[PDB]
Amino acid sequence: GADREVQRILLELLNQMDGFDQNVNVKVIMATNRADTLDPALLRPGRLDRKIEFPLPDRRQKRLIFSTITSKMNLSDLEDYVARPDKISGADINSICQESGMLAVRENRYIVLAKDFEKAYKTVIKKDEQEHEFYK
Amino acid sequence: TRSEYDRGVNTFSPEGRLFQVEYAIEAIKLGSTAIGIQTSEGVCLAVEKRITSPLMEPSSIEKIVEIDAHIGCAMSGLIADAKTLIDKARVETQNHWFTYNETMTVESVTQAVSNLALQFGEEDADPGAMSRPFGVALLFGGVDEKGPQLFHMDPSGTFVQCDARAIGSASEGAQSSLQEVYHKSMTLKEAIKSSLIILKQVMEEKLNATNIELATVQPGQNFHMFTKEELEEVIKDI
Amino acid sequence: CTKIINADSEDPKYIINVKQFAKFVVDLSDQVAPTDIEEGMRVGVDRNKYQIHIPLPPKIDPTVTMMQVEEKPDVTYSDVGGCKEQIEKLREVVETPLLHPERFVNLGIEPPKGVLLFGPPGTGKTLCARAVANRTDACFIRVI
Amino acid sequence: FRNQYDNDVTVWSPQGRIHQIEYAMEAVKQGSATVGLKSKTHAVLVALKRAQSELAAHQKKILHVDNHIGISIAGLTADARLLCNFMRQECLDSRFVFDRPLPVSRLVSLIGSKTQIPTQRYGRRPYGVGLLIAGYDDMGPHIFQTCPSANYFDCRAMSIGARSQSARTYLERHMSEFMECNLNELVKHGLRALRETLPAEQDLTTKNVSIGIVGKDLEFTIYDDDDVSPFLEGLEERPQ
Amino acid sequence: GNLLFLACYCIGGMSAIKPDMKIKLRMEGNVNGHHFVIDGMDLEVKEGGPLPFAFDILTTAFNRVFAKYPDNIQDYFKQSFPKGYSWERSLCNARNDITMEGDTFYNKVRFYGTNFPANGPVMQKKTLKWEPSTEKMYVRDGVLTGDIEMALDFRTTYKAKEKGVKLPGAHFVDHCIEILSHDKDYNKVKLYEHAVAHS
Amino acid sequence: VDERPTEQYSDIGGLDKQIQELVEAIVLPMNHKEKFENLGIQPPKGVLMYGPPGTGKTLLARACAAQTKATFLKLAGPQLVQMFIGDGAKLVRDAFALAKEKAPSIIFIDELDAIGDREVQRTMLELLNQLDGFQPNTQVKVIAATNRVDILDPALLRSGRLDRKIEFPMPNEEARARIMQIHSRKMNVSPDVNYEELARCTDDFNGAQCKAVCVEAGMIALRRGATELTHEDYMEGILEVQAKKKANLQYYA
Amino acid sequence: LKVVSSSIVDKYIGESARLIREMFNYARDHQPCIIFMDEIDAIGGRRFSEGTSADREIQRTLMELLNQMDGFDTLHRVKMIMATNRPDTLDPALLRPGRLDRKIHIDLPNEQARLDILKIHAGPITKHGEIDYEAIVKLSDGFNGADLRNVCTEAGMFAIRADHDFVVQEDFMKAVRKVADSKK
Amino acid sequence: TKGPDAASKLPLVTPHTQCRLKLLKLERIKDYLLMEEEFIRNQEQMKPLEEKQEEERSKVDDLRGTPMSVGTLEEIIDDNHAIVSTSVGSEHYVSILSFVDKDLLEPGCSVLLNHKVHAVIGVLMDDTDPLVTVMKVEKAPQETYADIGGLDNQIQEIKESVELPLTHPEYYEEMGIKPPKGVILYGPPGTGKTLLAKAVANQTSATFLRVVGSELIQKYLGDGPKLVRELFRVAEEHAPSIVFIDEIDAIGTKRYDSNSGGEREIQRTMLELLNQLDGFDSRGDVKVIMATNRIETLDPALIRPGRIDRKIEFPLPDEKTKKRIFQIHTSRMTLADDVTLDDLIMAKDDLSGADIKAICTEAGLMALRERRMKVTNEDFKKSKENVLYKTPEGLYL
C-alpha cells in the first residue's frame, strides 16, 4: 500500500503538470540530488522542459564563490586556494570561510590570514581515506 | 517449526526423528496396495493394477516381478526407483549364485537390497548413488531351507518377517482386516481366496481380469504368476 | 454507565457515555437506588439534566442473538467418531466430577476447574462436547 | 527464529553446545528399551523386540559380531546396521591379520573414532544409535554403552531405549548384589529390569524378548522364541 | 516488518436535542401500604395498581388551579400567583411540592398516612359521595388555616411564596368535590374540583 | 494488574539464595530507603534476573509481590516483538505510569526477548529512557526476568538501569522434593510415597517439570480408579511427564 | 528538545516526516531552542534505491529533516546536536556543511580523561582514608564513562554486603573488577 | 411474508431475421401494453372512493403529527416502551402508542416515531433505503441460457443450487441433504460468471438482488453492517430470493488485525455479512451467489462448507466451447460463405468469452472499414491479432 500511494502521488503530480486540463502561467521548479532515479515521465519536455545540472564549482566558479562569500569576511592567497584541485561544492566554500572566521574568533584576531584560513581549509576537506592499501 | 529439518536427510528433529525418511514412507501410499500372505504351503502376492487407460498393455505395468524362480517381489512406490531396486535384487541373487552356486535365503536378499537402500547418507556415493531415501516399499516372498518365508522391506532399510503384510495405498485397512482374517492354519487356496476378498473390499473398482496381478510361490514349483486363463480361474470362484 | 466515582452516598455522580454522542458526569433520579446502578449497564436518562432515570438491563432470551438454545442435545455417544482419546479425556473432565463427585472428594483433589479444546476448525470439537452434553445429564450452552 | 543454531553438526550454540548432538541423543530414546548385564564369567544382553504388527515378526535388537563380542542396538536401523557391518568387517580383518579376538576396549575406541567423523565433518549424519557392547577379554566381561555423541561409557549394567529410567533406578537399587550372581540370578535381574521398563499391561513373552549370551568358553549365541523359552521359565511374576 | 500501512477514516455523525421538558403532574403517597403514584383533570394511576383502599381517601389532594372567589372576598389563592401557594393538608397528611427533578417539572402532591383501621370505611372501597363541605378560612398565627368538616376534621394551611399578600378575612368557602367518571379498577378516573367562596 | 498473587513463599522452593538476593534487592531497600540515603547512594532501580524457562521466574516474582503486598504489573517480551511500532511509544510509557499512580507497584517484564530489527531498538530505548525517566526516590521497583544472558545491551545492563543480578541455577534434588511435596500439600497423599526417590528420579526435571509430574500424578490417581495417592500413580507420573506421548515410529531399531 | 531518532520512525506512512516538521516548527516557535537528535544514524543512513518500503520511508524522513534543517526557509537562533555511534553511515547530503558544519569526535576517554571521569564522579560517594584514581585507571582500560560510574554504584552496594556506612579501597577494587568482568 | 419480484416481459427471441414473425409477436405485445395503458387510464378516469373513516384517521394523524421520523427498533421492553435508534445512530427509550401493531414490532423493523417526544407511532414494512432498493433487480437482463455457450457443467451446478430448491425440492429432503446455502463462482476474468448470474436472473422465479461487494462499504460508522443487514432482511422478507454479490473480493480478502478505524469498519461489515450468511437456515429459500476472479485471495472462512458449500469453477473455454461461443456471437452477423472460423479456434491461445465477443465486434468493425457487412474470413484474421495484444520461440519443440 505504501509504494502504491507514493506512486499515486507521483502520478497525480504528472497528470497535474501536463494532464488534460493544461495550466496557464504556472511554472514549477523541482530540485533533486539524484536526477537519474527520477521517473522518465517527469523528465520529459512539457513537464520538465529544462534539466539544469549544478556541478561542483570549477576553478573560475570557485573564485567567484570565494569572493562573494569573503565580501563579508575580513581583509585577509585565496587565488592559490582556488587553484588547488579539490572536488568541493559551494557549501564547502561557505564552510571553509565560516570555519576560518570561527577559528579567528577562537584565537581572538579579527582578520583571518594564511594560518587559520589554511587550518580551516584542512578541517573542512578532510577526505581522510583510512583505506586499506590493498584496494589501491 | 518443523520446516527447518525436512530440508535434507542429514538433519535431526528435536524429537530425533527423520522427517525426510518419514516422507519417503508416506510416498508409498501414493503407490497401489500390495498384499502378501504367508502360509505353510507357500506365499502368495496379490497386487492391483490401478490402470489409467484401457489401451495400457498389462505387461508394461509390473506390480509383481520375480527376482529368481524361487523368489517373488512386490513393490509400492516410485516405479523407476522400484525398477532400480529390483534390478539390484536380481544382480545380487546372480552374484550369490556365482560365488556359492547356491540360491540364497530371501532374508539375505532383503539384506543386500537393504545395503543398496539406506545408502543415501553415505560417503560412498562419490561416483554416484542415491542422495535421497529410496521411495518404494518392498514385499519378498519365497521358499527356502526354512520353508516358506515372507519379508516386508521399508524404504529406510528396515526388514521384518511377516505372516501377512499389506503395503501401499490401502495398507492400514487391509492390514487391519487381515489381522482378524489370518489364521496360522491357512491353506494356500483359502489364503488366495482371502486375499482376493480383501482386494474386493479394498479395491476402488470391480474385480476383473485386468485389475489384479497375482503371483504364487510354493516349495514344489517356482515363482508363478497367474496367466490370463489362470487369473480368470482364480477370479471365477469369487 | 461507567465508573461509579466511589459514591458512598456523598458522590453519587457517574460518568455515562451516550453512544456516539458525548459523555457526561451526572447524578441519579430519586426513583432509582444506587444498588440498581453499576458500571457497564445500559441506563435511560433524561435530556437536559441527563439524570439516570431507569436502569435498562438488556434482558436474556434465546430469541435474540444466538444462545445455548439447548437443554438435552440429540447427539449421543454413537453419533461421535474419530475422537476416542479425545472423548475419553472429555469424559474424565466432565462426567467424572459431575456424576461421580465422590471419587474426587475422597481423592481430595479439586475437580478440573478449566479445560481447553484446541484444534483446527471442522474437526468436530463443538458437537463432541454436545455429545457429552447429552450424556452428562446437564444442559449444553453455546456462546459464540 | 532463534533456533537457527541446530541445523548441522558444524555450528556451536551461543551457550556452547552442538544441539544436533543433543537431538541425536534424544533420537535413540524412541527405540525400545534394552538392558545389558555381565556376570563374573558371562555377559548377557536382553532386548525388548518390538514388532510393527502382530501379523509379523519382531524387530531384532541383538546383533552378533564376534564369538566373544555381541552388540545390542537402540535407534536408527540404518546407522545401527552400518555400524554392525563395519564391526563384522573389522573383526574379520583382525582375525585375518592377528589371529586373536578383537579387544573390547580397542573395538569401542574404534567405534568412537569412526562415529566422531560424522560429528565433526560436514556430510554424513551423526550416528544416532545407542549401542550396548557385551564383550569378553582378559579382565573378564565388559559392558560398554556408546552414545550417538561419539562417546562411550563403561557401565556395570545399562538400559537404553524407551523408559530406561525405571531400569536405571532398578539397577541402582540392586547394585549391591550384581557382582556375585551366577547366570540364573543375573538373567532374572535383567528380565526384572526390562519388566520395570515395560508397563503393567504388557509382559515379557516369548516373541517379545531376545537374549544374547557370551562367555569364556561359550560363544555369543542369540536365543529365539523356542530358545529363549528356558530362560523365561525361571522368571517370576510381575509385582503388581 | 516492512509494513508501512496507510489509514482510512470512517466518521460517525453525532447529534441530539433536548426537547421541551414536559411537566408531569404526578402525586405520590404511601398512606397505608402501597407507594401509589398517579399522573394527571383526568386521573390515571401510574404505579400502585388497584388500590387496597377507596379512592376518596386521597381525592381531596388534587398550584395552577384555585377556587372561584367573588369580588368582595380577597382571593388569596389568586393573588399568590405567579409563584402559587403551598399547603399542608391534614386528614394522614398531604403536602404539595414543586421540584425540578430530571427533565420534568414535578408538581408533587406527596401523600402520607398512618393509623389505618383494620376495618375502617376507607379500605373496603365503599363510597356514596362527598356532600358539599364548607371550609371556614381564617388566620391563626399568620397562616391561612381552613377548618373543614369531612362528610361522605380538615386543618388546611395555605402559605403563599409571595409572603406579602394580605390575609383575607374569615370566610366560608363551599367545596363540592365528587368523583365524576372512573372505572371499577379505578385506573382511569376523572375528578371534579368545583368550589366557590361564600361570605 | 493483580494485587494479590497469593503466595507466602511456602509455595516456591529451591531458590533460597535467590529469594534472599531478591528480598535485599527490592524490599529491603524499599523498607530501608532511609539506610540507603544514609549511605549517600541511590538504591538500585533495576534488578535483572535470569535462568532457564523451567525455573519458575514468575512464581518467584509473584512470591516477591505477595511478600511486599504491593501492586503487581506484568509485561511480556515476546508480546512486544510483534504489534510493530508502539512498543514503548504508548505501552512502556503507559505501563510505567500505571505503576506510578497505583503505588506501591512491582513492575514485571518476563522472558528474555531480543534485547526489520528497528522496532526492538525503540522498545529498549523507551524502556531505558523511562526507567531512568522517573522519580529518584524509587517508590516502585521493576523485576526483569530473562531466559538467557547471551544478548546484553550495555545501556540496559549498565548501572542504574539494571544493577542487581539474580541467577536461577539448575534446580536440584532437594528443590524437586520440596516442590512436589508443596504441590501435593492439597493432596490426601499417604506418607508411603518416597518424595526423595521421585526427586532423584527427576533428573533434568526443573520446576515446571513438576507441574507436569505432580499434577499428572494427581489426575492419574484419578485415572487409576480413584485410588489413594500412593507411589502407584506417582512413579507412573514420573515415567510419563513430558515423554508421556509415545511416538511409536517404525524404521527404528 | 531531547529527541532520539529511533523513537520517531512509524509504520504510519507520512507520520515520521510530519513529526520532524512538528519538531522544527516548535523549535522555530520557541527560540532559543536546542534540538538534540540522538542516534541520528537511525534516520540519516545514506540514500539508496534498493526499494524496500521501510528504508524508502527512512529516506523520506531524512530528506524532510534536510529541508527542515537547511531548506528554503532559513533558520535563525536554532542550533541542533546529533549524536551517533556510526558516523560513517550518515548521508553525504546531511554530512555536507551548512547543515552539520562541525563533526566532533567525542571519543573514548584517554588515561587523563579516565582519571578525570573517576575524580568527577567520585564526588557524591564518601571516601574513608584513601582512594586512588590511578590504580583504577590502569585496571580499567577500555572503559568509557558510564561504566566507570557503574564502578561507584555497586561499590555502595558492595558496602551493604558487609554492612558498612562508607567505602574502602578494596571495595572499589572489587567493584571495578566486577564491572570489567561484566564488560567481557 | 410477501412474495418475490423482478417482473420481466416476453422472451420473444424466437425469430431474429426480422421476418415479421417478430413483427407479429411484437405487435401483439404492443397491443397488450396498449390495453394496459387504456385500462388503467380508464380506471383512474372513474374511481370515486375516499373518506369513510376520516375522523378517526384524522385524529390518529394529528396524534402522529408531521413530520414523522423513522428509526430501527433495536429492542423492546414491557409492552408500552421500546428502544428505537434514529438514522443518526442515537437510540432512545420511548413509549409505544396504542394504535401500533404490537404483533409487527420486532427487533429490526422500521418504526415511525414522533418528531418531538419520540414515541413509536407506526411500523413501516417497506423501508428499503434507496441503495438496497437499487440492488434489487427490477428489469430482468435480456441475456439467458441460450446466450451462454458451453459451461454446461457450470449451468447444471448453478441450476442444481439455486433453481432445484426453488422448483420441486423433494429430492433434497428425500435424500436428506440440506440445500446448498450459497454458491461462489470463480475463474479468470471474462469467463462468464456475471453472464451466468444474468442468465439466472432471467430464468428466475425469485427476487434477484445484484450487489457489487464494494457497494456494501459505506463511509459512516455502522452504515456498512446496517446496509448488509437491510439487504439480507429484504432478502428474507421477499423470500424466495437470490442475492448475487459480484466481486466478493472487494470485501472478501483475508481478514487481518485492523489498525485504522476504516479497516476496523471494513472488518465489521464483513463480520456482519458472515453473520447474516449464518443467520438464515439453509432450509430457507434464500440463496446467495458470489463471483470473483481472485479466488485465492478470499478469506478461508467465507468459503467454509458450513457457510458456502459449493465452489463453481469457470475455466477458460475449451475448443468446442470456443466454437460454441463463436456460433452464439456470430448469430446476428451476416457472415459470408468463405468464412470458416476454425483457424481462430485451432490457434492455441487463451481466448475467453469476452475475448471472442470482442473478436466478433472487431471483425464487424473491419468489415465496416471495407464498406461491407458480409464480413470475410480475412476480417476475423485481422481482428484476432487486433484485439489479442501482447515461451521463447524454439525453446520447446
Ligand SMILES: Nc1ncnc2c1ncn2[C@@H]1O[C@H](COP(=O)(O)OP(=O)(O)OP(=O)(O)O)[C@@H](O)[C@H]1O
Ligand atoms: N460461455 C460464453 N458464451 C457466450 N458469451 C460468453 C461466454 N462467457 C463469456 N461470454 C461473454 O463475455 C462477456 C463478459 O462476461 P462476464 O461479464 O460474465 O465476465 P466474468 O467472467 O464474470 O468476468 P469478470 O467478473 O472478471 O468481469 C459477456 O457479456 C458475454 O458476451
Ligand SMILES: Nc1ncnc2c1ncn2[C@@H]1O[C@H](COP(=O)(O)OP(=O)(O)O)[C@@H](O)[C@H]1O
Ligand atoms: N467425531 C465426529 N462425529 C460426527 N460428526 C463429526 C465428527 N467430527 C466432525 N463431524 C462433522 O463435522 C461437521 C462440523 O463440525 P463442527 O463441530 O461444526 O466443527 P467445529 O469443531 O470446528 O465446530 C458436523 O456437521 C459433523 O457432522
Ligand SMILES: Nc1ncnc2c1ncn2[C@@H]1O[C@H](COP(=O)(O)OP(=O)(O)O)[C@@H](O)[C@H]1O
Ligand atoms: N521453586 C518453584 N516453585 C514453584 N514453581 C516452580 C518453581 N520452579 C519452577 N517452577 C515452575 O516454572 C514455571 C514457570 O516458568 P518460568 O520460569 O516463568 O519460565 P521462563 O524463565 O521461560 O519465563 C511454572 O510452571 C512453575 O510452576
Ligand SMILES: [Mg+2]
Ligand atoms: Mg465478470
